[PDB]
Amino acid sequence: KSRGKICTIGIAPWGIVENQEDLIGRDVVRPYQTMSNPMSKLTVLNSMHSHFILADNGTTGKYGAEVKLRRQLEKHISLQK
Amino acid sequence: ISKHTQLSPTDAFGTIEFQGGGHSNKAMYVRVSF
Amino acid sequence: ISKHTQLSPTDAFGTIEFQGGGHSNKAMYVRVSFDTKPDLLLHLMTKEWQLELPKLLISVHGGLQNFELQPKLKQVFGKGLIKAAMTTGAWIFTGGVNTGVIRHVGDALKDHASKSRGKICTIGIAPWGIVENQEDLIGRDVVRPYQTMSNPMSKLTVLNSMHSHFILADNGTTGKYGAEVKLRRQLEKHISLQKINTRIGQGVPVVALIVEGGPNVISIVLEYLRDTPPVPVVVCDGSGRASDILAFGHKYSEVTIQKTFTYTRTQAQHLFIILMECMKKKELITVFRMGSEGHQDIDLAILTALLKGANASAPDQLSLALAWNRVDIARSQIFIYGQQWPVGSLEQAMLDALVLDRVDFVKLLIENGVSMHRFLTISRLEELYNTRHGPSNTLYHLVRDVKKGNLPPDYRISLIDIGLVIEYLMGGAYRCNYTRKRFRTLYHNLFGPKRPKALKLLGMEDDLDDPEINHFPFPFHELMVWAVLMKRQKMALFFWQHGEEAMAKALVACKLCKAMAHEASENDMVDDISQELNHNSRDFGQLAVELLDQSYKQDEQLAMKLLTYELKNWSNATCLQLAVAAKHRDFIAHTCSQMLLTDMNKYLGPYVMMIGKMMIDNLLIAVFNNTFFEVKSISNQVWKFQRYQLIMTFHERDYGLKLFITDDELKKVHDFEEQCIEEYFREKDDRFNSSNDERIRVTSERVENMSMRLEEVNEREHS
Amino acid sequence: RFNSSNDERIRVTSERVENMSMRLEEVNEREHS
Amino acid sequence: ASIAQARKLVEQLKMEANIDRIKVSKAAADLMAYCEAHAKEDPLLTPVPASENPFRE
Amino acid sequence: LDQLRQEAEQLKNQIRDARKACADATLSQITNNIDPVGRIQMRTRRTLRGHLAKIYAMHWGTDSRLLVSASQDGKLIIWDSYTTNKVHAIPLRSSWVMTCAYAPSGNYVACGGLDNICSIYNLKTREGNVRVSRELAGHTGYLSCCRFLDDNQIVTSSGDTTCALWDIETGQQTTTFTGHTGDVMSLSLAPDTRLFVSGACDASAKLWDVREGMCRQTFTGHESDINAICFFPNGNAFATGSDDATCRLFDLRADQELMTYSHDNIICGITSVSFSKSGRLLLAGYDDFNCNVWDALKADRAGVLAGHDNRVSCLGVTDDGMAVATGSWDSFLKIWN
């Protein structure tokens, strides 16, 4: 509909994506596959994104380990001028 | 266990390219602790 | 008497010419027995009447009276019926007399025939003795004119006009019913027994459209529901007759008191004994009503009616709609949340879409996650080159020319021969990747174990790990190549808008179109393929020039650097050389092309060419004065085109011809090119959408819709 | 070609707009409140 | 769906496993009894020049 | 009802299990005494010079004096083998015929191939010209190889998983040999005329018994398409030629492999193979330009007979075993001895 790259930021825990693999390449390009199977309980990362954050706590497949970091991030943004 | 984790360095971060979809989406991705 | 008939072979069959209406229509008729088998019927239809299998069968049952329903209510039915019969091949089963809904559908067919072109297979299946003109149609193989003006005295009904095909079931008696129901039902069964081209193994889907009717129509719809292959039933609410009472009875089931309408014999004759089953199968009832709920479009409701009754795998539904070529319905029904596409089905669907040349379906599948990288194999491309489900092409003739015509019957074409044909078209110095020895090894070691079984005797034949493999780093390049080769312009254009190095692809495509047009002109072709290929070459050159100019306006330095690198995909050249071989006047004459030469006389150069175009011929000065401006312009084009040849001649390899840069800068140029082409397409959309005529057309359509909605609002009277 | 010309579209749309305006005035005429 | 095909191999398998597959020591001696007795006539392993041969000029 | 696969699994045991119980003294230890052949060089006698292109098939004449030409030109040229001359030349309707069978008496010739039909031609017509007797339609796979029993009964090899036995005069086929899956490229008759073992794609030969249309034995142990097969003269064995560049000799009356006859330099397939009159020295035509005079009994090569610059496809050994004659794709035919 227009131009420009609107900065969209996503904070996702490490153990919930479908493919923690295929991304291990440090500071390098790794292609991703949009298609996914529903029998896998895990959910892929959102497409049409600008920047992504992979939160981590060690646990895999368990929600509730990302609200704290996001809240502190918004706190420091409030701490910004 | 009570969060018996380790100090392993982050070793999955950078920039990926989105295939399959109608547009090539680029997202700077970084594994990080909480 | 009980069916002891004078059985002689039939001797009346031919054509008619309608008289009385505004359309002179020709219809095919055969009078058969009321005990005829459907086998010879199908033989006659497919062979004699040249009627291929439709992708849909429509069963219509209506009253035999002369009822009338509300105007501005039948219009949506007519629109949906016409759309269904026109968009995809669908045969219509009816009687053919000028009564009931048959007269309505004949009027509808007359309506559309005055709107657009196209033909619709209408099959009139009625008993032979019903009509008054049982005579005047006895002569065989003669066009017998029919008179559509019907006298009021006769209790016999003429055949409704605007009919494509007539079939008459002789009964032994004259002017009675109850002898064509069985034949039509068995024909429907026979068509259900038939198999369509889809590899899923799907028969011909059949709908059951119910309008008006009577108590007998209730028996018919019960038969349709209770058959082992279920027949989905669509009901017309505006009928008022027994079909409409079933539509009313659909709502609020498990009262019976309200149904006591005394249709025949009050509540003494209550057919609830079978209406209980009729409403037991109410999940398959495909209701229809205009002005309420949603999806009031008759054709769209008809199509999805066979979809809810399909009950098969979702890929089967996708294949059926792809054959139907209705991408909107797949967008609507076959693509919803929670689809769980089975593994391997999507690749097969994409393959069959490619072999059927459906750009819209292909783009929808790709938007659903189908990736041409992983989907493409060498085997798939080879099968693409050896199919017959689409337009004609010269490729077999071209191969026979290049490969010296040593072919056996129905040879299976290989990729190496394709590359040989390509290199034959391109020119001398060209060398494709296919002819390279690495491709030779990959083909022989992997793709050639024993695939040409009958060729090993004839002798026309001469791995550790992998990236999945059978993988062309740039699959869209070869896809566009194949699309060009099979002469499919739209798919090639769609491929060209994706990928990288698109301008080089455009130049290559223009050169290929020019060469193929020359080949067509060389060997007594149909004289339209030649000019169509020339038009395609014109379009490719136009796209190349427009992209070049837009990139030049975007930036000058990067655009100058763009025509410099070697083409690791296209026999290792640069865009300038390709345009020279393609002989593109303006592209070479373009501003950026000229200044690109400068890094290696302007005035009097055209002056010499001025006189040369006059050397062929006060009257002379009158010719000279009126033939000077265009000649000057063309001479300028020629000189700006030939400046490259002059520079190379006066020069003659890191520079001088090309420029070589690292891969990272090539990636930067790739992103720059993708940005430029995206900008070009978006600006083209803006320019097309900003024209005043487009706004006028949109305003007209919205005004029409607003007037319809205003009338709809004015229909109600709350006070 | 005749029914796709801009001028015909303008004329038909203008007549439709005039009739629609008069009809909308008729609709607005009834004030039940 | 199709069960006769699986039978078809067995009837070929049953009547074949019991055939007279002779002993390899005895199998050789039958084949061994050929060459040394079939001696004077062969011009291809221990030949003689081409007087009575089929292929001289 | 799937136990039939378990019994076939059970019945698959006895062939190997009895064999390994039986395989106590293979051919390696029985006759190790006989000396290796060493250095024997065979000389070409006649070279049929004058043809145009690759020659695809050849069968000899039953007087050891003649053979039928089958080449890319399409001319079925009845070549005399005692003056390097010919008698008649018969171009076919289609130049793609991949076999030629010769009547055991010497009267007629079968032909077929890409046309998926078999045609028999009357050589000895009263007017002096060869004319086709009749065609044999009924095969949906191309005719790869074929041989007569006599001038009326002919076995044919087809690629549509059907092996046939055609009556000539009637034009009808009484029975069909069904039960072979790999496409049969060559058929080698047993000397009794009542048996034949064939070379097929499924790396399996079968003792197809003629008077029934039924398979007798299982001959498995090769690796790829069996492009060639030759019968051992005494009637008890047969050697095969395949694509895996290896010769694997088996036996009828013991049903076991004998040895391996392969070289590091032989990678290409085997086109045409032939025994000796005693079955001692074994011949094999290959895709490349080097043949070997193998020993199916001792894995010994008498020599390499390289005189053709093109692909070797067709050869024929005399009934009296007096010599061998090889034809290749260089439009020639040569008689090594």
UniProtKB/Swiss-Prot annotation, chain A:
The lineage of its organism: Eukaryota, Metazoa, Chordata, Craniata, Vertebrata. Disruption phenotype: Trpm3-deficient mice exhibit clear deficits in their avoidance to noxious heat. Trpm3-deficient mice display reduced hypersensitivity to thermal, but not to mechanical, stimuli in carrageen-induced inflammatory pain. In the chronic constriction injury (CCI) model of neuropathic pain, intraperitoneal injection of isosakuranetin or primidone do not reduced heat sensitivity in Trpm3-deficient mice. Residues 60-81 are annotated as: Calmodulin-binding. Belongs to the transient receptor (TC 1.A.4) family. LTrpC subfamily. TRPM3 sub-subfamily. Constitutively active, non-selective divalent cation-conducting channel that is permeable to Ca(2+), Mn(2+), and Mg(2+), with a high permeability for Ca(2+). However, can be enhanced by increasing temperature and by ligands, including the endogenous neurosteroid pregnenolone sulfate and sphingosine-1 and suppressed by intracellular Mg(2+). Implicated in a variety of cellular processes, including insulin/peptide secretion, vascular constriction and dilation, noxious heat sensing, inflammatory and spontaneous pain sensitivity. It comes from Mus musculus (Mouse). It is found in: Cell membrane. The gene is Trpm3. Disulfide bonds: none annotated. The chain holds residues 241 to 321 of 1732 of the full protein. This is Transient receptor potential cation channel subfamily M member 3.
Curated annotation (Swiss-Prot), chain C:
1,2-dioctanoyl-sn-glycero-3-phospho-(1D-myo-inositol-4,5-bisphosphate) binds at K602, Y603. Residues 1-600, 601-613 are cytoplasmic. Disulfide bonds: none annotated. Disruption phenotype: Trpm3-deficient mice exhibit clear deficits in their avoidance to noxious heat. Trpm3-deficient mice display reduced hypersensitivity to thermal, but not to mechanical, stimuli in carrageen-induced inflammatory pain. In the chronic constriction injury (CCI) model of neuropathic pain, intraperitoneal injection of isosakuranetin or primidone do not reduced heat sensitivity in Trpm3-deficient mice. Residues 452-460 are annotated as: Required for the inhibitory action of G-beta/gamma-subunits of heterotrimeric G-proteins. It is found in: Cell membrane. Belongs to the transient receptor (TC 1.A.4) family. LTrpC subfamily. TRPM3 sub-subfamily. Constitutively active, non-selective divalent cation-conducting channel that is permeable to Ca(2+), Mn(2+), and Mg(2+), with a high permeability for Ca(2+). However, can be enhanced by increasing temperature and by ligands, including the endogenous neurosteroid pregnenolone sulfate and sphingosine-1 and suppressed by intracellular Mg(2+). Implicated in a variety of cellular processes, including insulin/peptide secretion, vascular constriction and dilation, noxious heat sensing, inflammatory and spontaneous pain sensitivity. Homotetramer. Interacts with TRPM1; the interaction results in the formation of a heteromultimeric cation channel complex that are functionally different from the homomeric channels.
Curated annotation (Swiss-Prot), chain E:
Guanine nucleotide-binding proteins (G proteins) are involved as a modulator or transducer in various transmembrane signaling systems. The beta and gamma chains are required for the GTPase activity, for replacement of GDP by GTP, and for G protein-effector interaction. GO terms for molecular function: G-protein beta-subunit binding. It comes from Homo sapiens. Belongs to the G protein gamma family. The chain holds residues 7 to 63 of 71 of the full protein. Its main location: membrane. Keywords: Acetylation, Cell membrane, Host-virus interaction, Lipoprotein, Membrane, Methylation, Prenylation, Transducer. One of its GO terms (biological process) is G protein-coupled receptor signaling pathway. It is found in: Cell membrane. This is Guanine nucleotide-binding protein G(I)/G(S)/G(O) subunit gamma-2. G proteins are composed of 3 units, alpha, beta and gamma. In this context, interacts with GNB2. The heterodimer formed by GNB1 and GNG2 interacts with ARHGEF5. The heterodimer formed by GNB1 and GNG2 interacts with GRK2. Forms complexes with TAS2R14 and G-proteins; these complexes play a role in the perception of bitterness. Component of the TAS2R14-GNAI1 complex, consisting of TAS2R14, GNAI1, GNB1 and GNG2. Component of the TAS2R14-GNAT3 complex, consisting of TAS2R14, GNAT3, GNB1 and GNG2. Component of the TAS2R14-GNAS2 complex, consisting of TAS2R14, GNAS2, GNB1 and GNG2. It is a lipid-anchor. The keyword Secreted does not apply.
Curated annotation (Swiss-Prot), chain F:
This is Guanine nucleotide-binding protein G(I)/G(S)/G(T) subunit beta-1. Gene3D superfamilies: YVTN repeat-like/Quinoprotein amine dehydrogenase. GO terms for molecular function: GTPase activity; GTPase binding; protein-containing complex binding; signaling receptor complex adaptor activity. GO terms for cellular component: cytoplasm; cytosol; extracellular exosome; extracellular vesicle; heterotrimeric G-protein complex; lysosomal membrane; membrane; photoreceptor disc membrane. Belongs to the WD repeat G protein beta family. It comes from the Eukaryota. Coiled coil: none annotated. It comes from Homo sapiens (Human). WD repeats lie at residues 43-91, 92-137, 138-178, 179-220, 221-264, 265-306, 307-337. It is linked to Intellectual developmental disorder, autosomal dominant 42: A disorder characterized by significantly below average general intellectual functioning associated with impairments in adaptive behavior and manifested during the developmental period. MRD42 patients manifest global developmental delay commonly accompanied by hypotonia, seizures of various types, ophthalmological manifestations, and poor growth. Changing H88R: In MRD42; uncertain significance; no effect on protein abundance; no effect on complex formation with gamma subunit; no effect on trimer formation with apha and gamma subunits; no effect on receptor-driven G protein activation.
